[PDB]
Design a binder for this molecule. Structure first.
Ligand SMILES: O=c1c(O[C@@H]2O[C@H](CO)[C@@H](O)[C@H](O)[C@H]2O)c(-c2ccc(O)c(O)c2)oc2cc(O)cc(O)c12
Ligand SMILES: O=c1ccn([C@@H]2O[C@H](COP(=O)(O)OP(=O)(O)O)[C@@H](O)[C@H]2O)c(=O)[nH]1
Length: 454
């Protein structure tokens, strides 16, 4: 029997897009989807609704919070430092969520971040489902019960080792463990420390789910089910669905001018701005390779245009071999273009999936975020599908030479490390795209959802 599922993702394109990819897959199986989205953002999402008779968008008015820029709805609209104010705004949609649930009466609601929701759904006889599109390895590492019980006694040294029972081994750098130790405590919406918020969600929800498959995410989902004692489901890897919009002719034309697999595509998602010095090092490092390149970057902190921030003489030198562009582009369609030989990625979970299912060599440039870093270690050290750019142990900065080196290694047909990561990427791609992998993930996913509402 088909389920009625409401979708309430965090106000970020990296959550809205995979929630919508999964919504399409569920609607293909006959499930009805009530998709809650920020009002103005809906227009940018219609692109991905492949089943409009089963997936209905319901607009939310993102309420004012002092300090929130006017009209902002998504982390793509605000600086990263304003994230916590946008969380307060999510929290403030509770009254219009409460009334949406009372009239739509879904059986289940998928959600991010809003730990006040499972109390409302329990009142309404709705099952609450905390659905993560970040890596379960990340939540396991930072937000499992052993971490939370040390409360404010958790130090950087504590975060250099995994919590008790963690299924896997990888190494963080000092500046990374410092980042996790401090940001953990910072308020993220309505006065709630960041890790406490996610821990409240994990503790109060009826069930948990993650993007992923047993073959990769399995050990972390098993750890989390053991720790929190409730079902932790896998949706499958949320393979991107095809958009209703073809590749912009202007990019298709320009990309088509380059030899197959010769171009380096670099993008760091839609939420982040580099500091100027690392903006310069990254671009000079791309230039040093001599390969054509497309870099999708916001102007660095303090700057409003790409032009103003470019290293001196850069435009005149790179000529028509390189473009630095700050607008939103069709990343999934660009990564499929045969010109792209290399993807320099900030290791956002969505970008990771989009690179893995394509042929591009992966260069890992994780930005300062627990999920990006943990994704980069898993991809670089466990799956060994990419080469990570070296950062300073204490300062977290990279040189132009380290960018150049990583791209040169993966692009060199005769380099054994490049051949190794190509071979391992092929293995992972063949797994993720296996004819029965995503479908059997979704088979199990939907049976366990049926169990949840039983
Ligand atoms: O990145 C994390 C994360 O998602 C992101 O939180 C950033 C803010 O810090 C946002 O700006 C990005 O839009 C969001 O994708 C989340 C998160 C995502 C969805 C949830 O429903 C949830 O409860 C936690 O948790 C983390 C926990 C960590 O210990 C370390 C992390 O890096 C994250
Ligand atoms: O200019 C852009 C930037 C991002 N994306 C898409 O936005 C999502 C970004 O998710 P990810 O988790 O990689 O990074 P974030 O932007 O949240 O840091 C992915 O589906 C990308 O393909 C896009 O289409 N165009």
């Amino acid at each position: 029997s088909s389920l009625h599922i409401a979708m309430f993702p965090w106000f970020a394109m990296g959550h809205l897009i995979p929630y919508l990819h999964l919504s399409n897959k569920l609607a293909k199986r006959g499930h009805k989807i009530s998709f809650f989205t920020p009002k103005k953002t809906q227009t940018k999402l219609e692109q991905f609704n492949l089943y409009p008779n089963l997936i209905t968008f319901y607009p939310l008015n993102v309420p004012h919070v002092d300090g929130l820029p006017f009209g902002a709805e998504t982390t793509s609209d605000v600086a990263i430092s304003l994230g916590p104010i946008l969380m307060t705004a999510m929290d403030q949609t509770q009254n219009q969520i409460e009334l949406l649930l009372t009239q739509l009466k879904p059986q289940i609601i998928f959600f991010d971040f809003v730990f006040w929701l499972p109390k409302i759904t329990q009142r309404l006889g709705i099952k609450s489902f905390l659905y993560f599109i970040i890596n379960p390895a990340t939540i396991s590492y930072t937000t499992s019960p052993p971490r939370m019980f040390e409360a404010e006694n958790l130090t950087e040294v504590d975060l250099m080792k995994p919590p008790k029972g963690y299924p896997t081994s990888f190494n963080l750098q000092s500046h990374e463990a410092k980042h996790l130790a401090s940001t953990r405590k910072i308020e993220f919406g309505s006065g709630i420390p960041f890790s406490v918020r996610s821990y409240n969600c994990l503790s109060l929800t009826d069930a948990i789910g993650f993007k992923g498959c047993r073959e990769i995410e399995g050990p972390y989902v098993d750890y989390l089910q053991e720790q929190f004692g409730k079902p932790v489901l896998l949706s499958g890897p949320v393979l991107p669905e095809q958009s209703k919009t073809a590749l912009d002719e202007k990019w298709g034309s320009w990309l088509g001018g380059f030899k197959d697999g010769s171009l380096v595509y670099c993008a760091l998602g839609s939420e982040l701005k580099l500091k100027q010095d690392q903006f310069h090092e990254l671009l000079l490092g791309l230039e040093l390779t001599g390969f054509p390149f497309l870099a999708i970057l916001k102007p660095p902190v303090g700057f409003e245009t790409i032009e103003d921030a470019l290293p001196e003489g850069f435009k005149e030198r790179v000529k028509e071999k390189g473009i630095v562009h700050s607008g939103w582009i069709q990343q999934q369609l660009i990564l499929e273009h045969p010109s792209v030989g290399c993807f320099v990625t900030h290791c956002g979970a969505g970008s990771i999936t989009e690179g893995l299912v394509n042929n591009c060599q992966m260069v890992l440039l994780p930005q300062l975020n627990g999920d990006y870093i943990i994704n980069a270690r898993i991809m670089g050290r466990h799956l060994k599908v990419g080469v990570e750019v070296k950062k300073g142990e204490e300062d977290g900065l990279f040189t132009k030479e380290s960018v150049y080196e990583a791209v040169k290694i993966v692009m060199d047909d005769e380099n054994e490390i490049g051949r190794e990561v190509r071979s391992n990427h092929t293995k992972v791609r063949n797994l993720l795209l296996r004819h029965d992998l995503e479908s059997s993930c979704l088979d199990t996913f939907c049976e366990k959802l049926q169990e949840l509402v039983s």
